[PDB]
Structure formats: structure tokens, C-alpha cells
Amino acid sequence: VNPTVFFDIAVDGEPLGRVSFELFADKVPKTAENFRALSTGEKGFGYKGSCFHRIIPGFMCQGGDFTRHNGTGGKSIYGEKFEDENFILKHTGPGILSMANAGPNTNGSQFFICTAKTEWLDGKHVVFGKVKEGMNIVEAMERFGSRNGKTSKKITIADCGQLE
Amino acid sequence: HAGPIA
């Protein structure tokens, strides 16, 4: 029953590969259904066309800011932001999909894909999904990142939606 | 500004 969605990544317009995720709607429903609805585009905005503004090798790839494309805003499906669902799931390793907030209870549309164990984020960031396939795509676009998160190339979500 | 830090 756990939704599966995907991202078709491209490096400067040129298609890179597909990355799919399993969303734990059974544990984190509002948070999962938020990501799910934004991956497809069930409301007119969403992750399509948006990019990964912040990428730090060995840490994570952050995207989701479809409105500002910098990390300032972006927005969920419930107006603007919403509270933390819970912290049941932990940042166990690469592939982990977590919400990128700006202080407790400010989950909007932004998220990050882990490329390493980041347990220090446990309790601060809501873990709601994980890459199922395409961890080598996430890793390929990671090299186009940096220390401060600036991307040396324009990594975009060329396409996205729900496979089940 | 949103995002996790190391």
C-alpha cells in the first residue's frame, strides 16, 4: 500500500536517470501524502521542473523549493507549512528521504535525499521515505554539488509521478 | 531558509 513515486533527474537539460522512492504513508501519512501529491502534481505546482538547489557530497541532496528555488519558501499541499508528524523513522543511511525544515514544525515542500548515515538529524527532521531504485543516479548528481551546497551544474527533476 | 546541516 506504501506509495512509490519517482524523479527523472537531468544534468543541464540532458536526462541523467530515474530515482524512485517508497513513501511510508503508514507511519507518516500527511508527510507522505504531501510528497506523493507534489511528485505527481495533483494541484498545479509540485516538484516538476524544480531543482536541487543544495547538494553536499557525503551528506545530502536537497530540493523541493519549487516557488523560490533557493530554500526560502516552497509550499506543501496545505497552504504553506505543517507540523512534524513524528520521528519514528531515523536517518539510517543513504537513500533516506527526509523533510528539510527551518526549525521545528515547519515542513513545507522541501526535502533531502541522504547519501550517508545522518543520525544527528534524528528528532529534528521527519524521515518519511527512501530511494527504492536509482541510488546511483542520486550519487551521480551528488558529484555536481559542493561544500556549501552550490551545484556546479543544473540538476533538475525533468519529470515525476506515482508508479503505485 | 530551510535545510539540514552536518
Q: What is the side-by-side strand order in the sheet with A111-114?
A: A54-56, A60-63, A111-114, A96-99, A127-133, A14-23, A4-11, A155-162
C-alpha grid cell, residue A146: 559542493
Residue A73 is part of which domain span? 1-164
Distance CA A147, CA A33 (A): 32
Distance CA A67, CA A2 (A): 28
Domain count, chain A: 1
User: Could you say which DSSP state residue A120 is in?
Assistant: G
User: Could you say which DSSP state residue A112 is in?
Assistant: E
- This structure's resolution (Å) is 1.6
C-alpha grid cell, residue A45: 505546482
1-6 of B, contacting A, C-beta below 8 A: 1-4, 6
Nearest CA in chain A to B3: A100
* CATH number of the structural domain spanning residue A88: 2.40.100.10
Q: Do B3 and A112 touch (CB under 8 A)?
A: yes
